[PDB]
Design an enzyme around this catalytic site. Structure first.
Site, PDB file in Angstrom:
ATOM      1  N   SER A 112       0.864  -1.193   0.000  1.00  0.00           N
ATOM      2  CA  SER A 112       0.000   0.000   0.000  1.00  0.00           C
ATOM      3  C   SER A 112       0.893   1.233   0.000  1.00  0.00           C
ATOM      4  O   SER A 112       1.932   1.223  -0.671  1.00  0.00           O
ATOM      5  CB  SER A 112      -0.805  -0.542   1.139  1.00  0.00           C
ATOM      6  OG  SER A 112      -2.007  -0.557   1.868  1.00  0.00           O
ATOM      7  N   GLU A 128      -8.936  -6.562  -3.971  1.00  0.00           N
ATOM      8  CA  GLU A 128      -8.326  -5.485  -3.202  1.00  0.00           C
ATOM      9  C   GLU A 128      -9.237  -4.782  -2.194  1.00  0.00           C
ATOM     10  O   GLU A 128      -9.176  -5.061  -0.990  1.00  0.00           O
ATOM     11  CB  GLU A 128      -7.727  -4.440  -4.147  1.00  0.00           C
ATOM     12  CG  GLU A 128      -6.514  -4.923  -4.964  1.00  0.00           C
ATOM     13  CD  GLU A 128      -5.224  -4.949  -4.165  1.00  0.00           C
ATOM     14  OE1 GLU A 128      -4.191  -5.313  -4.738  1.00  0.00           O
ATOM     15  OE2 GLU A 128      -5.230  -4.599  -2.968  1.00  0.00           O
ATOM     16  N   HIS A 151      -7.106  -6.517  -0.139  1.00  0.00           N
ATOM     17  CA  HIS A 151      -5.910  -5.729   0.115  1.00  0.00           C
ATOM     18  C   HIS A 151      -5.267  -6.049   1.470  1.00  0.00           C
ATOM     19  O   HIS A 151      -5.959  -6.164   2.472  1.00  0.00           O
ATOM     20  CB  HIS A 151      -6.342  -4.279   0.090  1.00  0.00           C
ATOM     21  CG  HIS A 151      -5.220  -3.311  -0.034  1.00  0.00           C
ATOM     22  ND1 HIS A 151      -4.362  -3.310  -1.110  1.00  0.00           N
ATOM     23  CD2 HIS A 151      -4.836  -2.287   0.762  1.00  0.00           C
ATOM     24  CE1 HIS A 151      -3.496  -2.325  -0.970  1.00  0.00           C
ATOM     25  NE2 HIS A 151      -3.760  -1.690   0.154  1.00  0.00           N
TER      26      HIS A 151
END
Ligand SMILES: *[C@@](=O)([C]S[C][C][C][C][C][C][C][C])C(F)(F)F
Length: 530
Positions: free
Chosen positions: A191, A322, A436
């Protein structure tokens, strides 16, 4: 029980701990890699460390940088929060510690540039350190502390990224003391962390600090944020405004901030958190400034176009679903409502602040029409966010890199739907695929949520994935390739794009992108060069 080692600035005492199985490693947490940014230093580049005497307690992580965590919830358990958070943690296979080398891994944690930490609550080195490699995590300045930007000399912007460079340099000098090879450092992030990593990889000011990198769901130009200068000004002048400042001189605004108490800043940034959801400040393209380490000297996208970082071989990752992981917060902020009110939310901040008036409008249209037929709804946005913020950026990078005559690039799609998923647990989620941050959990041991569980040797499906994933990470840092059989996971070819589909433990398979995926690409391409 108590291990001692020397570092450039003094002696430190870590702890001997257990990795998976019988394996043991020396672990020094909370070691300082620079002077703490405490006074006139709060927003300024990090200063060198005055040496110290006796043995510095590197028993456990120190406090965590000032922030407001709008995401991790109880997954992260800080031993405190303070502006004096600039410390790193170094873990090494016990046998490898010098007493008069190994490949090392430097990891940059995610958290949207506004929160998170490098702690072992979420970043357990147990799996990795069990593979004969050194693991190094650390904290860098977050939200306003590390990303405020006054296009000034004291605050040119990107302090947070500088902290990373400071620490990568600190690693170059101190690697040996730990029995690690400074000539073989691998930078990784996920990220914001991955995005920061990618960015550093483009910074001529980070040259020689690492041999390759790993991008776990993040890129220098991922749409979930923007390095746009106008935007910086906006949000900044919006902060100072909301914070009560009235001064106008760059430096004066600074002083007022310097003398502002932590909490007043934290509240004022938590204000922006309410307004933007999961992020506040960001890295920015900076103008050359006097005696300033320019970390980012241009638009990532244009930099990449000129092959600005093509010689750092890397692993580019991304998950199946995600943004399914964010549902819980999407609701808290009520993105559906927000979308109705701001139809531009569907448009990459980077285009809204770069494109032309009519341009935007049309795209704003196109985007809306694209995911919201009958109604602006949750799942529609989740699709948008996943494609636009992660899937697209990752594949577009794999492609662009494979056709620039640069270093190799390995692309993967994590689609494994584990039996136990810490983030769905803590947030009460329910979806198929991999959201994610989950792939990050099969490489790092989420010590704050596991128990005394033994993952290696693997037996359950989930631990088998742990083994496989952490193996890709150590092979890459050992042989600059995620596999020991070059044909099991081929380099990315421009003429035939394919990604290693991580999904079933111990089963290789590079496949083409599905129909939608292809559609998504085209769609997003046309949008990005409109
Ligand atoms: C990671 O660093 C990714 S940062 C993604 C922030 C934007 C997500 C969409 C927000 C819409 C309101 C981490 F997940 F933060 F850790």
């Amino acid at each position: 029980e108590e291990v001692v080692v020397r570092t450039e600035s003094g002696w430190i005492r870590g702890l001997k701990r257990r990795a998976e199985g019988n394996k043991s490693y020396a672990s020094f947490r909370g070691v300082p890699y620079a002077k703490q940014p405490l006074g006139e230093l709060r927003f300024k580049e990090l200063q060198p460390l005055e040496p110290w005497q006796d043995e510095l307690d590197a028993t456990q992580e120190g406090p965590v940088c000032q922030q407001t965590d709008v995401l991790y919830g109880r997954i992260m358990r800080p031993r405190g929060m303070s502006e004096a958070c600039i410390h790193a943690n170094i873990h090494v296979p016990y046998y490898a510690l010098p007493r008069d080398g190994l490949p090392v891994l430097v990891f940059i944690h995610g958290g949207g540039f506004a929160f998170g930490s490098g702690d072992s609550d979420l970043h357990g080195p147990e799996y990795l350190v069990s593979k004969d490699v050194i693991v190094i995590t650390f904290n860098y300045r977050l939200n306003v502390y590390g990303f405020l930007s006054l296009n000034s000399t004291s605050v040119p912007g990107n302090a947070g990224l500088r902290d990373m460079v400071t620490l990568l340099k600190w690693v170059q000098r101190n690697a040996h003391f730990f029995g690690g090879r400074p000539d073989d450092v691998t930078l990784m992030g996920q990220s914001a962390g991955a995005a920061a990593t990618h960015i550093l990889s483009l910074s001529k000011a980070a040259d020689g600090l690492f041999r390759r990198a790993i991008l776990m769901s993040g890129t220098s130009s991922s749409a979930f944020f923007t390095t746009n200068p106008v935007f910086a000004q906006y949000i900044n002048k919006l902060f100072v405004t909301n914070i009560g400042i009235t001064a106008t001189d760059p430096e004066e605004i600074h002083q007022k901030l310097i003398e502002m108490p932590a909490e007043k800043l934290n509240e004022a940034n938590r204000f922006l958190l309410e307004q933007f959801g999961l992020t506040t400040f960001f890295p920015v393209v900076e103008s050359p400034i006097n005696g300033v380490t320019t970390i980012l000297d241009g638009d990532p996208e244009q930099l990449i176009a000129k092959g600005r970082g093509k010689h750092i071989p890397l692993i580019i990752g991304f998950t199946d679903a995600e943004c399914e992981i964010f549902r819980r917060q999407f609701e808290q902020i009520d993105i559906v409502s927000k979308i109705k009110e701001n139809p531009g939310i569907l448009v990459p901040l980077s285009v809204l602040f770069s494109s032309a008036p009519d341009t935007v409008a049309e795209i704003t249209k196109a985007m809306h029409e694209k995911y919201f037929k009958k109604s602006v709804d949750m799942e529609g946005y989740i699709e948008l966010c996943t494609d636009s913020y992660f899937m697209y950026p990752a594949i577009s990078l794999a492609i662009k890199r494979a056709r620039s005559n640069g270093a190799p690039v390995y692309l993967y799609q994590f689609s494994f739907d584990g039996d136990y998923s810490v983030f769905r647990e803590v947030n009460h989620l329910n979806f198929e695929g991999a959201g994610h941050i989950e792939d990050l959990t099969y490489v790092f041991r989420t010590n704050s949520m596991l128990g005394g569980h033994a993952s290696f040797p693997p037996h359950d499906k989930d631990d088998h994935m742990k083994y496989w994933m952490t193996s890709f990470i150590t092979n890459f840092m050992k042989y600059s390739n995620p596999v020991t059989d070059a044909k099991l996971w081929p380099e990315v070819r421009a003429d035939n794009l394919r990604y290693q589909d991580i999904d079933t433990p111990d089963v290789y398979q590079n496949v083409k992108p599905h129909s939608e995926q292809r559609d998504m690409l085209d769609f997003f391409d046309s949008i990005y060069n409109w």
